[PDB]
Amino acid sequence: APDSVDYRKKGYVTPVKNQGQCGSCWAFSSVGALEGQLKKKTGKLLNLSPQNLVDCVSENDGCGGGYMTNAFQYVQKNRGIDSEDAYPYVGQEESCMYNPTGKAAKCRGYREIPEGNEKALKRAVARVGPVSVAIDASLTSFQFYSKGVYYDESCNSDNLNHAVLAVGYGIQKGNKHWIIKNSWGENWGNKGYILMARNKNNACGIANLASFPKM
Amino acid sequence: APDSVDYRKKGYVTPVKNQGQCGSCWAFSSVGALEGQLKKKTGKLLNLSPQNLVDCVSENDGCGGGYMTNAFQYVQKNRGIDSEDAYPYVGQEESCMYNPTGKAAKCRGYREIPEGNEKALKRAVARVGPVSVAIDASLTSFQFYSKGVYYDESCNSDNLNHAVLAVGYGIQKGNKHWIIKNSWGENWGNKGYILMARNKNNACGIANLASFPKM
Ligand SMILES: *C(=C)CNC(=O)[C@H](CC(C)C)N[C@@H](c1ccc(-c2ccc(S(C)(=O)=O)cc2)cc1)C(F)(F)F
Ligand SMILES: *C(=C)CNC(=O)[C@H](CC(C)C)N[C@@H](c1ccc(-c2ccc(S(C)(=O)=O)cc2)cc1)C(F)(F)F
Ligand SMILES: [Ca+2]
Ligand SMILES: [Cl-]
Ligand SMILES: [Cl-]
């Protein structure tokens, strides 16, 4: 695979969003990955609806949390997901108001990356586009991350608690990284982004629960 | 729906198992629901493999716990689940060893019972067959149950932690119940079974995360 990949340069990534007070990271991560595959397959970049997933993926717990795999499975079973424009983000779980008329993307399944394999995750990002990942974002250092290749000895590879999107990889000042899009608004981190350490023993559990949707 | 039903009498329930020191209750629960539908579809009762689920259902956590819907989705995506004889129970998680030659049943999706709805669980047990259900099995009273209709007010319907199989319902001396098959061996409770309070405000959360497979 190439030495560096950055899908923001290819126009596969929408602006950084802000989940606000809802534990909907899983929904933003899932929509990011679907947006990337829709740009790859059609040429068009569009914002899809995280609210649609928050209110309608009965396997997840809405603002209480959830997994990206369950979201891809709902879009597949549902035969579609709405655009953000047809089903806006409000930040609170409400009843399911899916509108078929506004469906803007579909899902034919998902693929998972081999557990804990960052070489396999690198190949996937290069071959597919953005991939949904889970990580330990619990440490205070992550929360107050600012710039640089994030790395902290404390990170627990098996306390996965947040969902984000890997949109590329590379190296900065000698340190290999993953380019991660968060859902904490543009004021967090590096304009909403964080470079997390790569090939540093699966730092933060970045390659433990990575998946992407099929289209 | 009839007043009373018991699938044990119709030949739809296999013998009681023992999960051992592995938190695979979800797998036993999932396979029990699949066994019931297989019997109804083919007229044959046989043991399906919970181990195939523990080892292969990547959405769950093996012996660490899981959900039943993930299990039915795996059998759907994989085009099959193996018999017990083709994939025996070992009680520890191991790598996937699914064998297509040993396939004993298929699944075309699942249906979830609406949350907290005992009347809907009741209808499903009557017209579909055994249903997988989740409950709070954390109290000492549940652990030590021997006979009668189990009812306890400190059972927290918001603390679901164990998965079992609703194989019927009825009434015992004016107490309506649910006939439940557990995965704690043939000595726990009443030969492996517990009668749990029915129509008593969703006791133990019996109707909070119930579902069954389509075949
Ligand atoms: C995002 C801001 C919050 N983090 C998560 O949602 C996180 C993401 C993972 C690690 C990719 N997942 C959390 C989580 C919380 C609740 C649930 C959940 C799923 C189903 C049900 S149910 C079947 O009873 O309706 C209840 C709760 C799953 C995942 C985490 F706790 F971190 F695991
Ligand atoms: C049975 C003896 C143990 N109980 C359960 O498995 C229980 C059953 C429900 C209430 C029907 N579910 C537990 C559970 C524990 C862990 C997980 C889980 C799923 C996926 C992952 S992952 C995505 O990181 O691979 C981690 C953990 C699900 C369910 C319970 F905690 F009770 F919810
Ligand atoms: Ca699922
Ligand atoms: Cl590399
Ligand atoms: Cl009744």
Give the domain ranges of chain A.
Answer: 1-215
Distance between CA atoms of A69 and A72, rounded to whole angstroms?
5
Of B59, B109, B112, which is closest to A69 when you measure between CB atoms? Answer: B59
CB B3 within 8 A of CB B170: yes
Distance between CA atoms of A105 and A46, rounded to whole angstroms?
9
- Judge if the beta carbon of residue A57 lies within 6 A of ligand 1: no
Q: Do A58 and B109 touch (CB under 8 A)?
A: no
Q: Do A67 and B58 touch (CB under 8 A)?
A: no
CB B16 within 8 A of CB B191: yes
Q: Do A77 and B112 touch (CB under 8 A)?
A: no
Using only C-alpha atoms, chain B has a radius of gyration, in whole angstroms, of 16
What contacts B183, CB < 8 A, 6 or more positions away? B16, B17, B18, B19, B24, B25, B28, B29, B164
Question: HSE of B118 in the Cβ direction (CA atoms, 13 Å)?
Answer: 18
Q: How was this structure determined?
A: X-ray
Maximum Cα–Cα distance across chain B: 49
Residues in chain B closer than 8 A to A72 (CB atoms): none
What contacts A50, CB < 8 A, 6 or more positions away? A17, A19, A24, A27, A28, A30, A31, A84, A89, A183
- Spot the catalytic one: B52, B60, B78, B182: B182
Residue A156 has which token pair?
A: 């627990």
Residue A197 has which token pair?
A: 């350490």
- Spot the catalytic one: A52, A182, A202, A208: A182
CB B89 within 8 A of CB B50: yes
**How far does Cα A111 stand from its chain's mean position?**
14
CB B22 within 8 A of CB B63: yes
Distance between CA atoms of B23 and A202, rounded to whole angstroms?
27
Task: Tell whether the torsion through CA atoms of A200, A203, A208 and A212 is positive or negative.
Answer: negative
**How far does Cα A15 stand from its chain's mean position?**
13
Side chain identity, residue A192 = G
Q: What is the 3-state secondary structure (H, E, C) of chain A?
A: CCCCEEHHHHCCCCCCCECCCCCCHHHHHHHHHHHHHHHHHHCCCCCECHHHHHHHCCCCCHHHCCCHHHHHHHHHHHCCEEECCCCCCCCCCCCCCCCHHHEEECCCCEEECCCCCHHHHHHHHHHHCCEEEEECCCCHHHHCCCCCEECCCCCCCCCCCEEEEEEEEEEECCEEEEEEECCECCCCCECCEEEEECCCCCHHHCCCCCEEECC
Distance between CA atoms of A105 and A83, rounded to whole angstroms?
8
Distance between CA atoms of A199 and A111, rounded to whole angstroms?
22
CA nearest B58 in A: which residue?
A112
Distance between CA atoms of B29 and B71, rounded to whole angstroms?
10
This structure's resolution (Å) is 1.7
Q: Do B69 and A77 touch (CB under 8 A)?
A: no
CB B177 within 8 A of CB B169: yes
Altogether, the residues listed in chain B come to a count of 215
- Judge if the beta carbon of residue B209 lies within 6 A of ligand 1: yes
Of B58, B69, B70, which is closest to A112 when you measure between CB atoms? Answer: B58
> In which region does residue A134 sit, left (phi positive, over 0), alpha (psi from -120 to 50) or beta (all else)?
beta
CB A98 within 8 A of CB A56: yes
DSSP per-residue codes, chain B: --S-EEHHHHT------B-TTS--HHHHHHHHHHHHHHHHHHS----B-HHHHHHH-TTS-GGG---HHHHHHHHHHHT-EEBTTTS---SS-------GGGEEE----EEEPPTT-HHHHHHHHHHT--EEEEE---SHHHHT--SSEE--TT--TT---EEEEEEEEEEETTEEEEEEE-SB-SSSTBTTEEEEESSSSSGGGTTSS-EEE--
**How far does Cα A105 stand from its chain's mean position?**
16
The domain A1-215 having CATH identifier 3.40.50.2300: the answer here is no
CB A177 within 8 A of CB A157: no
Of A58, A73, A109, which is closest to B112 when you measure between CB atoms? Answer: A58
Maximum Cα–Cα distance across chain A: 49
Residue entry with tokens 């819907």? B69
**How far does Cα A60 stand from its chain's mean position?**
16
Distance between CA atoms of A140 and B123, rounded to whole angstroms?
50
Distance between CA atoms of A24 and A30, rounded to whole angstroms?
10
Q: Which residues of A115-149 are buried (b: 16+ CB within 10 A; e: fewer)?
A: ebebeebbebbbebbbbbbbbbbbbeebeebeeeb
Ligand 2, atom 13, lies closest to the CA of B65
- Judge if the beta carbon of residue A20 lies within 6 A of ligand 1: no
Distance between CA atoms of B196 and B205, rounded to whole angstroms?
11
Q: What is the dihedral of CA A164, A102, A21, A26, to 10 degrees?
A: -30
Altogether, the residues listed in chain A come to a count of 215
β-pair partners for B5: B169
Distance between CA atoms of B54 and A158, rounded to whole angstroms?
19
